[PDB]
Design a protein around this ligand. Structure first.
Ligand SMILES: Nc1ncnc2c1ncn2[C@@H]1O[C@H](COP(=O)(O)OP(=O)(O)O)[C@@H](O)[C@H]1O
Ligand SMILES: Nc1ncnc2c1ncn2[C@@H]1O[C@H](COP(=O)(O)OP(=O)(O)O)[C@@H](O)[C@H]1O
Ligand SMILES: Nc1ncnc2c1ncn2[C@@H]1O[C@H](COP(=O)(O)OP(=O)(O)O)[C@@H](O)[C@H]1O
Ligand SMILES: Nc1ncnc2c1ncn2[C@@H]1O[C@H](COP(=O)(O)OP(=O)(O)O)[C@@H](O)[C@H]1O
Ligand SMILES: Nc1ncnc2c1ncn2[C@@H]1O[C@H](COP(=O)(O)OP(=O)(O)O)[C@@H](O)[C@H]1O
Ligand SMILES: [Mg+2]
Ligand SMILES: [Mg+2]
Ligand SMILES: [Mg+2]
Ligand SMILES: [Mg+2]
Ligand SMILES: [Mg+2]
Lengths: 100, 541, 538, 520, 155, 51
C-alpha cells in the first residue's frame, strides 16, 4: 500500500525558518534595542562624542546625530529597525532629537 | 536479518513520492502538527492580540495580527495547512473581514474532533453531522438579530459598525481612526434625500496615502488625493481663479507621431529653414485652443516633452505625470471629467471642476494636494496617515481596508444586520446546538455536540489574552444566560473583570451577520476537506 | 509513530509485511523447487576462497549462503533444525511454508482474518496426527528382513546420487545397519557409524570395513606393518615428557652430575614401559605368529618409539576421543588409563591388522573381528566436493534408515501421504469437527497446499503436472468401491502412477510428523505478523 | 559562546506537546498487540538475531528511541515484568491514554501540571477501592479453577490450542517450586530448549537435564538408584596458591615429583570412595588419570558443570555444595534419585536425572520444550513466564479480579459517577481518568472488528443494571458476562497497571523544558 | 548472453519477468483500487510547485505521477485510451488487469502455458458479448424525461 | 520505462551472489570456458608439444 520503505514527517514551517514561543523572544527583542541604545548613550548631550562608522564599501562617514548612523548600519533584526524608522521619521518631520 | 527487502512496490512510484495514508495514522499526524499554527492565530486574536513579524525571502518585513496577511508569506510545506491558507484568503478578497475567526474555528473543529475519531466514529458520518449542523447554524442566526439598520447614511450610526472593527486591530486608537473612516464614507456617499436601488460602492474609492512622521492624532481627511511628486513650472494662485478645469489626456502632449517609425526627409534647404518654426507653430495651433477655454491644469500619463511644457509655463497651466494607469482614473472621479486620448479641444461637458490645488510638505517631502471645498465628489476619498514607523502604518492600511471592506459587505447585499459581540452570540449557539442534538436520535448526535464545543475558544481566547483564569469567568458566564437581558451578556476586558459581566450597549461592540455566516461556511468547508481526505501524496522538492 | 521517535528507521505495516513474507517465501521456494526429487538439478557453492562443495541438501544451501531477509532466516532455522535431529525432510519444510503462505494469502486479500485461518491449520493438523495412526503399517523387527532395509536405503540415495553410486553404496549402509540391531535394541548412530575422508581411485570404489580404521600408522620403518593376531591395549597416559607443575632447574654442579640428572628423564618413561614389558611377558607365547599393538590418545615421545620398535610392538599415537570409545566395541576388550593395574582380560582381539600408505599419509586397517559390536564406513572419493557430496548423502541416509528401527512403523511416500490427506480433509464431515465460522477455507487451503509437493517432483521431469494426476484421482475413486486397500505413487520415468509397496519407495515416520508441525508453526507465526521494523543501538 | 547548551531550547507549551505526542506514539506501535486476536511483531536487532513476539515488554526491549520522554515510557515494561510477569502491554497502552486525555486540559484550559497530580492520587485511592470491591475471592487448592486461571493469559498467545497441556505443564512446575508465606522464584525454573519435536509429547520431568555425556565409555549408562555427590574443585593436580620452585639436586627427585602427582590424585579419589558414590559431578574440569580409579569403585565422571546447574542439583538430590574433599561424609551425599539415562539426539548428548518423588528445601525441575524451530522455542518460553507469573499472584493474594476489561470499566463508571459530586477545580482532571479506562475495552473491541460506539454504549447501560462482571467477548465481539465466559485474571496485575500508569504520568507531567547535548 | 552484446544491458527471463509483471500490476491495483465506488478515498496530488488537487479518477492520478515501472506504463496508457474515448471506468480497467494477471498467474504456477490461458480469455470475451447484447435493455429517449436522466447522472 | 525494477526479491541473498542456470546458453559458455584453456593443451601434448 505504501510507496516505499519509510516516510519522514513533514516540518510545518519551511526548513531553516526560525521561530520561538514564550517570553524569551520579547526579552531578546528588548535587549536588541538596548544593544543599539548603548551605542547612542554617550552621544547625547553637548559634551557627547561622535561615532565613526565604516561600511563594507570602505567609505568613511563620521556623524553625531543618530539619523545617518542607523542608516549606515544595515539592521537585520526587525525590533532594532524600529529605532531606525523613528529616527528617519524624526529626521524627516522635525530634524532634531533623533538620538533622544 | 540485516537489510530489509526494501518494500517490493519500489518498482512503483519514485522515492520522492511520500504516502501518508490512514490507518497508518494520517489524521493523528495532521490535526496535531497544525496545532502550532493554530496557536499563532489564537494568540493574535482579540483586541489584546499580539502581532507577528513575518520576514519573507526578499526581506520586506511586515507586522500584522491577522491571518490572511501572515499565511500569504509563510512558505508552508505541509499540504493540509494550505487548505486553511487560501480558505482564509477567500474571506480576505470577498468580505475582507473574519480571517482570524476562520482560523480559530476551522482548526478547532479538527482539534475537537479528536474525540470522535479516537472513539471510533465513522469519518463519513462526521461530514454529514457538521453539514446538518451548519444548516441549523445559518437558520438560527437570523432570530438573534437586534440591530436592523435601514438608514446607513449618517456618521453616528457607523459608530456601531466601524469602531468594533477598528477596536480589534490596535485597540488603543478608536475615536481617531473611526473619525477618519467614517468621515471618508460620508464624503464617498452622495448627498441625497433617498439613495436606493443598491448604490454602487467599491474598495478602490477610499485610498490610503502613507506619510512618514507625525503623531496619529495630527492626521486629517482629504477629499482628493496626495501624490509624492514634484510640480513643475510655476507656483499656484490658491485663491484667485476660485475654480479650475482639469483635462486628463491619456496620450502625451506632443506632435502626433505614428506607431510605425518615421524620420525627417528634406529634399532642399528651404524646408530646413521652416522646420524649426514648423514644430513650434504646430503645437501652438493645438495648445492655443486649450488655453482659450481656460483649462488651468493638464494631466498627461506618458512623458511630456519640453516643447509642450514651455508653452504651458507662460500661461500658468499645471502639469503632472501620473505614470501608473490605475491611479490615473481616480483623479478623473474627483474633478468629474472623462479621459481623452485625442487632443481635440476642451469641451464644457467633458471637463470637470476643481476648487484649488496647493503644494507643501507634510513629512518633509513635497507633495501635491487636490483638496477642494464646496465641490461635487462621487466615490473618492483619502486618509492621510501620520506615524512614527512605516511598519506600523502598513497595519493601519490593512485595518482601513478591512473597515471599508465591511462597508462593501453591507451595501452590496440587501442587509448586513448586526449581532451581539464580545462573546455573546457564540455561547448562545452552544445552547441552541445542545438542544438541537437531543431532538434527532441517531449515531450522529456525538458530532452535533462536538460541533458546539468548537465555539468555546471565542470567549476564552479574549480571557487568555486578558490574563484571566478561563475556569472562572467562562463557567460564571453560563450562569448569566439562565432565564432581553440574557442575550447581551459578554466577556469583559478590564481590571474590574472579576465579576465577568459587562453590558454590550455601554460601548456598542457588535459583529456582522453576513461575515459570520460566510466564516462559518468556509470554516466548515475547510474542516470538511481535511476530514474527508485519507491519503496525502507528496513529491520531490 | 516511529519517525518522530527514531530519527532513522524503516517500517512496513498491514500490506507490505504480508507481501514480504509471501514474496520472500515464493523466492526461497523457487530456489529449492528444482532440487526436490530424484531428477532434480545439482547445486554447487563457491565462496571467495575458491573452494568447491557440491550437494543437493537444502541445509547446506541455507547454512552457507548469507541471507538478509527476516523471513528466510526463520525458514533457514526451521529447515536446519528439522534436519539436524531427523536427518531428512529439509526441502519439504521449505515447500510447505513456501506454499502454505501463498495459498492462504489469496484469502487474506479476500478479507478473511489471519487468526481464524491459522485456527483452521491447527485443528487440521490434529486430524493429520489421527490419520498417521491409521495410515501407517506395523512391521516386526524379529524377521530381520535385509531386503526391506535395502529398499529404504535406495529411497534417499537415489535422490542425491545416480544409480551407479546408489547400487555400490547401498549395501555399505545395510551392512553397517545390520549390526545396529541387538538384544538391547538401543540405537547408537554417532559413536558406531562414522565417516572419514580419503582421496583415492574413485567414488565407486567405496568398500565396507567391519573394524575401526585409523588415519595414522607406524612412524619407524623397522616397526611391523602387517600383524596377524594383534591384541590391542588402550592407554590414555601420555608417554612423552611432562613439565611438572612449577618444577624448575636440575641444578647441576659438576659436569658428571649434569648428565646424571638428564638420565632421570628416561626413568619416568621407563617406569611405564616396564609395565608394558611385564604385560608382554604374560602373552609372550607364539610371539612370531601373534603380535601386540598400543594405541594412545595423547602423543608419544620419539625417544620411546625405539623401545616399541625393538620388541616389534606397533605404536599409534594421538587418537581421537571417539576412537577410544569404539575400540571396546570392535575388539571386545576393555579400556585402561593407568599402567599400575593390568590384566589379560582387558586386551582385545583382532584377526587381521595391516597398513597401506599413499603419498605422505598412511592409514591403518583393522578387521576380521570375532564379534564386532561396531564398524565404520570408509568412503572413497576423487575431489573435495565429491567427499562433501558423499558426506551429505551418507549423513542423510543413515539417519533416515536408522529411524525405521527406532519405531515399529514406516510411512510410504511418493505422494501417497499428501494425496491421502487431500481426500481426507476435503471429504470429512465438518460437523464432527469443532471449527465453525470462516474456517471453511482454512481446511481447503492447507489441504490444497499439500498437492504442490508431489507435482514438484513432476516439474523436474518436464511432464504436465496437472495431467498425470488425472488417472491418480480416477484410481482412488474406484479403489474405495473396489474393496481393495492400495496406495498409489508417482513414477517419473513413464509419467504414470505406481505402488510404493512393491517399488520400494518409503519414508520415515518422524520426518513427515515433525515437518508439518515445524512448518505449521512457522507459517502460522508469519501470517499473524502484520508489521516489520528495525531499531537498535549500533 | 557560552556552555554546551542552547542549541534549540524547546520551552513553554510546545515542549509538553511533543511529550504527549511522543508518549502516544509508543502506545500506537503496540496498539494491535492486545486482546485474543492480537498480531505478532518481528523486530530486527542490529547484531543479527530476530525476536518474534507480541508481548509489549519484549517488543520495547529491542526498540531504541532517541527521545528522553519516550524512554521513561520504555522503562515501565521492566516495572511490570520484574514485579508480576503479566500485563506489560496493558501498562504501556493505559498510560498513553492517561497522558493523552489530560492533555486537552494542559493545552487549553490551563490547569497547571500540579493540580492534575493532586486529582490523580484521589483517583488512585478510589481506583484501589473499587478494584478491591469488584474482585471476588477464589479457592487456591481447586485444581479445576486453577487450570482455567492459568490459561487466561495463554489465550492471548499462540499456544491456546495446546492450552490443555500448558496448564498441566505450568501447574506441576509451580507446585514443585512452591515452598510451604508461599514464596517462589523463577531462578531455578530451567529454560533449557530442545529444537524440534511435537508439543504433545513434551512434558515436565522432575529433576535436571544436562547437555553433556560421561567421559569414559565403561561408565554405567543406566543406574537404578544414583547417589550424586557435588564437587567444586577440579580433579587435576592443584598447582597451589604459591609457586613451588623445587630445587632438584638428586636424580631420584624428579621421578618422585611426578610420582606424588599420581599419589595426590589417588588420595583425593580414595577418600571419595569411602562413601562409594555412583555419580560424581565436578564443577571445574577433570583429569584423565583420576577417572579410571573412580571407575574402579563404580562412580561416574562428567565434564565441567557450571554452578548454576549444580545449585539445582543440590536441591533435587538433597546434596550440599562441597569443595573440601577431606571433609566428605555420608550425610551430605545425595540420595533418593529416581533414574539415570542418556538419550541420543543429533545436536548434543543429554543426561536425564529423575527423582523418586518421595518438609524441607524446595524442589527444582526442568521443563521440556519440543517446538518447531528456534524462534518457536523462545516464543513458547516467554509464554511459560507469562503463564507461570499468573500462578504466583493467586497464592500471594487469594483475590481474583474480573477480566475482559470489566475491572478497568468498573473504575471508569465509579470515577464518572463520583466526578459530579466532586464539584471544584479538581473535577476536570478527575473526570478525564474515566475517559482512558474505557479505552482498554476500546482496544480490545477494535481488534475484533467490532464497533466501539454502540458496544460501549450498550456496555455502560448494562454495567449499572446487569452486573459488575460484564465484558466484551474478544473472539465473537458481543457482550458476554465473565461468570459464564469462565475466564478470570488475578487482581494484582490490575493494581500494578493502575499504579504504574498513573505514577508515570505524575513524573512526565512535571517536564518543563528539554535540553540535549550537555556532556557525557 | 545479452551481456556479450552490451555489457551495460540487463535481462529478466521466464520467472523474474513474470513476477515483475504481476507484482507491478498488483502494486498498481493495491494503490488505485481504493477510489472505486462512492465510499472511496480522496488523493492529494502535491507536486514540487505546491499545487494541490483533489480527484478520484485514475487518469489524472497517473498523468501527474510519472510511472517508473515498465508494466504499469502499459496499464496507464490503457486508462488514457479509456478516458479519451469514454471518460469513465479507468478504475475498472486497472482492477481487471490486476485480477486477470493474478488469477492467470495462479494457474501459470500450476504448470499451464500462457497461450491457452489467453485463448480462454478471448473465447470468454466473445462469450460475454453474446451475453452483453442479450443483457442490455432498450428504452425510448424521445420522451426526454428528466427523472431517468437525474438518477443516471446521480449514479 | 527509464529504469527496470532491477530483479525484485533480490534481497533474499547478498548482492555479490549470482546464479547461473542451464538456460541462456550458459552451459555452452562453460564449454567455451573450457575451450579457452583446452586449446592451450593442444600445443602441449605429444613429443612436439610446446612448453
Ligand atoms: N546650552 C544648553 N544648555 C543646556 N542643555 C543643552 C544646551 N544645548 C543642548 N542641550 C541639551 O542637550 C541635549 C542633546 O542635544 P543635541 O544632541 O545637541 O541635539 P540632537 O540630539 O537633536 O542632535 C538636548 O536634550 C538638550 O536639552
Ligand atoms: N471593548 C471591547 N469589549 C468587549 N469586546 C470587544 C471589545 N473590543 C473588541 N471586542 C471583541 O473582540 C473581537 C475581535 O474579533 P475579530 O477577530 O477582530 O473579528 P473578525 O474575526 O470578524 O475580524 C470582536 O468579536 C469583539 O466583540
Ligand atoms: N525414486 C523416487 N520415486 C518416487 N518418489 C521419490 C523418489 N525419490 C524420492 N522421492 C520422494 O521425494 C520426497 C523427498 O525425499 P528426500 O530427498 O528424502 O527428502 P527432502 O527432499 O525433504 O530432503 C519423498 O517424499 C519421497 O517420497
Ligand atoms: N479472551 C479475552 N477476551 C477479552 N479480553 C481479553 C481476553 N484475554 C485477555 N483479555 C484482556 O487483555 C488484557 C491483557 O491480557 P494478556 O494479553 O494476557 O496480557 P498482556 O497484555 O501482557 O499480553 C487483559 O487486561 C484482559 O482484559
Ligand atoms: N451508488 C453506487 N452503488 C453501487 N455501485 C456503484 C455506485 N456508483 C458506482 N458504482 C459502481 O462503480 C463502478 C465504477 O463507477 P465510477 O466510480 O463512476 O467509475 P470510475 O471507477 O471509473 O470512477 C460501476 O461499474 C458501478 O457498478
Ligand atoms: Mg540637535
Ligand atoms: Mg475584524
Ligand atoms: Mg532426503
Ligand atoms: Mg498476558
Ligand atoms: Mg465513473
Amino acid at each position: 500500500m505504501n510507496f516505499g520503505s519509510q516516510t519522514p514527517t513533514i516540518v510545518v514551517l519551511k526548513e531553516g525558518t526560525d521561530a520561538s514561543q514564550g517570553k524569551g523572544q520579547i526579552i531578546s527583542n528588548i535587549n536588541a534595542c538596548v544593544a543599539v541604545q548603548e551605542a547612542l548613550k554617550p552621544t547625547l548631550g553637548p559634551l557627547g562624542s561622535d561615532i565613526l562608522i565604516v561600511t563594507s564599501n570602505q567609505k568613511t562617514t563620521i556623524s553625531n546625530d543618530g539619523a545617518t548612523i542607523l542608516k549606515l548600519l544595515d539592521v537585520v533584526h526587525p525590533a532594532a529597525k524600529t529605532l531606525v524608522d523613528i529616527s528617519r521619521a524624526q529626521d524627516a518631520e522635525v530634524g532634531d532629537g533623533t538620538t533622544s | 536479518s540485516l537489510r530489509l527487502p526494501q518494500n517490493p512496490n519500489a518498482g512503483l512510484f519514485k522515492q520522492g513520492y511520500n504516502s501518508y495514508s490512514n490507518a497508518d495514522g494520517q489524521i493523528i499526524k495532521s490535526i496535531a502538527a497544525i496545532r502550532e499554527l493554530h496557536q499563532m492565530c489564537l494568540t493574535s486574536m482579540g483586541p489584546c492580540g499580539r502581532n507577528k513579524i513575518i520576514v519573507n525571502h526578499l526581506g520586506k518585513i511586515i507586522i500584522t495580527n491577522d491571518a490572511a496577511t501572515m499565511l500569504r508569506e509563510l512558505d508552508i510545506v505541509h499540504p493540509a495547512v494550505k487548505v486553511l491558507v487560501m480558505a482564509t484568503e477567500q474571506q480576505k478578497i470577498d468580505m475582507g473581514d473574519g480571517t482570524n475567526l476562520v482560523m480559530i474555528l476551522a482548526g478547532e473543529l479538527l482539534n475537537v474532533s479528536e474525540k470522535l475519531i479516537s472513539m471510533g466514529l465513522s469519518a463519513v458520518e462526521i461530514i454529514q453531522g457538521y453539514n446538518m449542523a451548519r444548516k441549523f447554524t445559518l437558520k438560527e442566526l437570523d432570530e438573534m438579530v437586534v440591530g436592523e439598520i435601514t438608514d446607513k447614511n449618517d456618521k453616528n450610526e457607523l459608530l456601531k459598525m466601524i469602531k468594533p472593527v477598528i477596536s480589534s486591530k490596535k485597540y488603543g486608537s478608536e475615536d481617531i481612526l473611526s473619525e477618519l473612516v467614517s468621515e471618508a464614507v460620508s464624503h464617498v456617499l452622495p448627498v441625497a434625500q433617498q439613495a436606493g436601488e443598491i448604490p454602487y460602492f467599491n474598495v478602490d474609492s477610499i485610498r490610503v496615502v502613507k506619510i512618514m512622521g507625525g503623531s496619529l492624532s495630527n492626521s486629517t481627511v482629504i477629499k482628493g488625493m496626495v501624490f509624492n511628486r514634484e510640480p513643475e513650472g510655476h507656483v499656484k494662485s490658491l485663491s484667485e481663479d476660485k475654480k479650475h478645469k482639469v483635462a486628463v489626456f491619456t496620450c502625451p502632449l506632443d506632435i502626433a507621431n505614428t506607431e510605425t517609425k518615421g524620420t525627417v526627409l528634406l529634399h532642399n534647404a528651404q524646408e530646413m529653414l521652416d522646420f524649426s518654426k514648423g514644430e513650434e507653430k504646430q503645437i501652438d495651433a493645438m495648445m492655443k485652443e486649450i488655453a482659450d477655454m481656460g483649462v488651468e491644469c493638464i494631466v498627461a500619463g506618458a512623458g511630456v516633452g519640453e516643447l509642450a511644457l514651455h508653452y504651458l509655463n507662460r500661461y500658468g497651466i499645471l502639469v503632472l505625470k501620473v505614470p501608473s494607469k490605475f491611479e490615473l482614473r481616480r483623479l478623473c472621479r474627483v474633478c468629474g471629467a472623462t479621459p481623452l486620448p485625442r487632443l481635440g479641444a476642451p469641451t464644457p461637458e467633458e471637463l470637470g471642476l476643481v476648487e484649488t490645488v496647493k503644494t507643501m510638505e507634510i513629512g518633509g517631502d513635497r507633495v501635491t494636494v487636490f483638496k477642494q471645498e464646496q465641490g461635487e465628489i462621487s466615490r473618492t476619498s483619502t486618509i492621510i496617515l501620520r506615524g512614527a514607523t512605516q511598519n506600523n502604518l502598513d497595519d493601519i492600511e490593512r485595518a482601513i481596508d478591512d473597515g471599508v471592506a465591511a462597508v462593501k459587505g453591507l451595501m452590496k447585499p440587501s442587509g448586513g444586520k448586526l449581532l451581539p459581540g464580545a462573546g455573546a452570540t457564540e455561547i448562545e449557539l452552544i445552547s441552541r446546538i445542545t438542544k438541537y442534538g437531543e431532538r434527532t436520535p441517531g449515531l450522529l448526535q456525538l458530532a452535533i455536540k462536538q460541533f458546539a464545543v468548537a465555539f468555546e475558544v471565542v470567549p476564552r481566547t479574549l480571557a487568555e489574552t486578558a490574563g484571566l483564569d478561563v475556569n472562572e469567568v467562562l463557567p460564571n458566564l453560563y450562569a448569566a444566560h439562565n432565564v432581553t437581558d440574557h442575550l447581551y451578556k459578554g466577556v469583559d476586558i478590564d481590571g474590574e473583570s472579576d465579576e465577568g459581566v459587562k453590558d454590550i450597549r455601554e460601548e456598542n461592540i457588535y459583529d456582522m451577520l453576513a461575515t459570520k455566516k460566510f466564516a462559518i461556511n468556509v470554516a466548515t468547508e475547510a474542516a470538511t476537506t481535511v476530514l474527508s481526505i485519507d491519503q496525502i501524496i507528496m513529491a520531490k522538492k | 509513530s516511529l519517525q518522530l521517535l527514531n530519527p532513522k528507521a524503516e517500517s512496513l505495516r498491514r500490506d507490505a509485511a504480508l507481501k514480504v513474507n509471501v514474496t520472500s517465501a515464493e523466492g526461497l521456494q523457487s530456489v529449492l523447487e528444482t532440487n526436490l526429487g530424484p531428477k532434480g538439478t545439482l547445486k554447487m557453492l563457491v565462496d571467495g576462497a575458491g573452494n568447491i562443495k557440491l550437494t543437493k541438501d537444502g541445509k547446506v544451501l541455507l547454512t552457507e549462503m548469507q541471507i538478509q531477509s527476516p523471513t528466510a532466516v526463520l525458514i533457514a532455522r526451521a529447515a536446519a533444525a528439522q534436519d539436524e535431529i531427523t536427518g531428512d525432510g529439509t526441502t519439504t519444510v521449505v515447500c510447505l511454508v513456501g506454499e502454505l503462505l501463498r495459498q492462504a494469502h489469496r484469502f487474506i486479500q479476500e478479507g478473511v482474518h489471519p487468526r481464524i485461518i491459522t485456527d483452521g491449520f491447527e485443528i487440521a493438523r490434529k486430524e493429520s496426527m489421527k490419520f498417521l495412526d491409521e495410515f501407517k503399517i506395523s512391521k516386526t523387527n524379529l524377521s530381520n528382513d535385509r531386503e526391506f532395509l535395502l529398499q529404504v536405503a535406495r529411497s534417499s540415495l537415489l535422490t542425491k546420487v545416480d544409480a551407479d553410486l546408489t547400487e555400490v553404496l547401498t549395501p555399505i549402509v545395510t551392512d553397517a545397519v545390520l549390526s545396529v540391531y541387538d538384544a538391547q535394541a538401543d540405537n547408537l548412530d554417532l559413536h558406531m557409524v562414522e565417516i572419514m575422508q580419503m582421496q583415492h581411485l574413485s567414488p565407486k570404489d567405496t568398500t565396507f570395513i567391519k573394524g575401526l580404521v585409523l588415519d595414522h600408522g607406524g612412524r619407524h620403518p623397522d616397526m611391523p606393518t602387517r600383524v596377524k593376531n594383534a591384541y590391542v591395549l588402550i592407554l590414555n597416559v601420555s608417554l612423552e615428557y611432562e613439565k611438572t607443575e612449577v618444577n624448575s632447574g636440575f641444578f647441576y654442579s659438576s659436569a658428571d652430575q649434569r648428565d646424571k640428572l638428564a638420565a632421570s628423564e628416561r626413568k619416568f618413561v621407563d617406569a611405564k614401559l616396564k609395565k608394558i614389558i611385564d604385560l608382554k611377558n604374560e602373552v609372550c607365547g607364539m610371539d612370531p605368529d601373534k603380535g601386540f599393538v598400543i594405541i594412545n590418545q595423547k602423543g608419544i615421545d620419539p625417544m620411546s618409539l625405539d623401545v616399541f620398535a625393538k620388541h616389534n610392538i606397533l605404536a599409534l599415537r594421538r587418537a581421537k576421543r571417539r576412537n577410544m570409545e569404539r575400540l571396546q566395541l570392535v575388539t571386545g576388550g576393555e579400556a585402561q588409563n593407568s599402567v599400575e593395574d593390568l590384566s589379560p582380560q582387558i586386551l582385545g582381539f583382532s584377526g587381521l591388522v595391516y597398513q597401506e600408505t599413499i603419498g605422505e599419509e598412511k592409514f591403518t586397517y583393522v578387521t576380521e573381528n570375532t564379534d564386532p559390536k561396531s564398524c565404520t564406513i570408509l568412503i572413497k572419493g576423487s575431489t573435495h566436493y565429491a567427499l562433501a557430496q558423499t558426506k551429505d548423502a551418507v549423513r542423510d541416509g543413515l539417519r533416515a534408515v536408522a529411524n525405521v528401527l527406532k519405531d515399529k512403523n514406516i510411512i510410504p511416500g511418493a505422494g501417497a501421504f499428501y494425496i491421502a490427506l487431500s481426500r481426507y480433509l476435503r471429504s470429512a464431515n465438518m460437523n464432527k469437527l469443532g471449527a465453525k465460522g470462516k474456517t471453511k477455507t482454512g481446511i481447503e487451503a492447507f489441504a490444497e497446499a499439500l498437492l504442490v509437493i508431489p507435482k514438484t517432483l513432476v516439474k523436474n521431469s518436464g511432464f504436465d503436472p496437472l495431467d498425470v494426476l488425472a488417472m491418480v484421482e480416477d484410481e482412488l475413486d474406484d479403489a474405495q468401491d473396489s474393496d481393495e486397500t492400495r496406495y498409489v505413487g508417482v513414477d517419473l520415468n513413464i509419467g504414470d502412477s505406481c505402488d510404493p509397496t512393491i517399488e520400494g519407495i518409503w519414508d520415515s515416520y518422524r520426518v513427515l510428523r515433525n515437518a508439518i508441525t515445524g512448518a505449521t508453526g512457522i507459517a502460522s507465526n508469519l501470517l499473524l505478523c502484520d508489521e516489520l521494523l528495525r531499531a537498535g543501538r549500533s | 559562546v557560552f556552555m554546551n547548551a542552547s542549541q534549540e531550547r524547546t520551552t513553554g507549551r510546545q515542549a509538553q506537546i511533543s511529550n504527549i505526542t511522543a508518549a502516544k506514539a509508543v502506545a500506537d506501535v503496540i496498539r494491535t498487540c492486545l486482546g485474543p486476536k492480537a498480531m505478532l511483531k518481528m523486530l530486527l536487532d542490529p547484531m543479527g538475531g530476530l525476536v518474534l513476539t507480541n508481548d509489549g515488554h519484549a517488543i520495547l526491549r529491542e526498540i531504541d528511541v532517541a527521545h528522553p520522554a519516550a524512554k521513561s515510557m520504555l522503562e515501565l515494561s521492566r516495572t511490570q515484568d520484574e514485579e508480576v510477569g503479566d500485563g506489560t502491554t496493558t501498562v504501556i497502552i493505559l498510560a498513553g491514554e492517561i497522558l493523552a486525555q489530560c492533555a486537552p486540559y494542559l493545552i487549553e484550559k490551563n490547569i497547571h501540571p500540579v493540580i492534575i497530580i493532586q486529582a490523580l492520587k484521589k483517583a488512585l485511592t478510589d481506583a484501589l477501592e473499587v478494584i478491591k470491591q469488584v474482585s471476588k475471592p477464589v479457592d487456591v487448592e481447586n485444581d479445576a479453577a486453577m487450570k482455567k486461571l492459568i490459561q487466561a493469559s495463554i489465550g492471548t498467545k499462540y499456544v491456546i490450542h495446546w492450552s490443555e497441556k500448558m496448564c498441566e505443564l505450568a501447574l506441576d512446575a509451580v507446585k514443585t517450586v512452591r515452598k510451604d508465606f508461599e514464596i517462589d522464584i523463577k531462578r531455578y525454573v530451567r529454560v533449557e530448549k530442545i529444537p524440534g519435536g511435537d508439543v504433545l509429547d513434551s512434558r515436565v520431568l522432575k529433576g535436571v537435564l544436562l547437555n553433556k555425556d560421561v567421559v569414559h565409555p565403561k561408565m554405567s549408562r543406566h543406574i537404578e538408584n544414583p547417589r550424586v555427590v557435588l564437587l567444586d574443585c577440579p580433579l587435576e593436580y592443584k598447582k597451589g596458591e604459591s609457586q613451588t620452585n623445587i630445587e632438584i639436586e638428586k636424580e631420584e627427585d624428579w621421578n618422585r615429583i611426578l610420582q606424588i602427582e599420581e599419589e595426590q590424585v589417588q588420595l583425593m579419589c580414595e577418600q571419595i570412595l569411602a562413601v562409594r558414590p555412583t555419580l560424581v559431578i565436578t564443577e571445574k574440569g577433570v583429569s584423565d588419570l583420576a577417572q579410571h580409579y573412580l571407575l574402579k569403585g563404580g562412580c561416574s565422571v562428567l565434564r565441567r558443570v557450571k554452578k548454576s546447574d549444580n545449585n539445582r542439583i543440590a536441591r533435587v538430590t538433597g546434596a550440599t555444595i562441597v569443595n573440601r574433599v577431606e571433609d566428605l561424609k555420608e550425610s551430605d551425599v545425595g540420595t533418593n534419585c529416581g533414574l539415570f539415562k542418556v538419550e541420543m539426539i543429533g545436536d548434543e548428548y543429554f543426561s536425564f536425572l529423575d527423582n523418586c518423588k518421595e518438609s524441607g528445601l524446595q524442589k527444582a525441575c526442568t521443563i521440556m520444550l519440543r517446538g518447531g524451530s528456534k524462534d518457536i522455542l523462545n516464543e513458547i518460553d516467554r509464554n511459560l513466564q507469562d503463564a507461570m507469573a499468573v500462578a504466583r499472584n493467586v497464592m500471594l493474594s487469594p483475590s481474583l479480579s474480573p477480566g475482559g476489561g470489566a475491572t478497568e470499566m468498573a473504575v471508569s463508571v465509579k470515577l464518572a459517577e463520583k466526578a459530579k459530586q466532586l464539584e471544584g477545580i479538581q473535577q476536570w482532571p478527575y473526570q478525564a481518568v474515566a475517559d482512558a479506562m474505557e479505552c482498554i475495552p476500546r482496544t480490545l473491541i477494535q481488534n475484533a472488528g467490532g464497533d466501539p460506539i454502540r458496544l460501549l454504549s450498550q456496555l455502560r447501560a448494562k454495567h449499572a443494571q446487569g452486573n459488575f462482571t460484564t465484558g466484551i467477548d474478544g473472539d465473537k465481539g458481543k457482550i458476554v458476562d465473565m461468570v459464564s465466559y469462565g475466564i478470570w485474571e488475578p487482581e494484582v496485575i490490575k493494581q500494578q497497571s493502575v499504579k504504574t500508569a498513573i505514577e508515570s504520568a505524575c513524573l512526565l507531567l512535571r517536564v518543563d523544558d528539554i535540553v540535549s547535548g550537555v556532556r557525557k
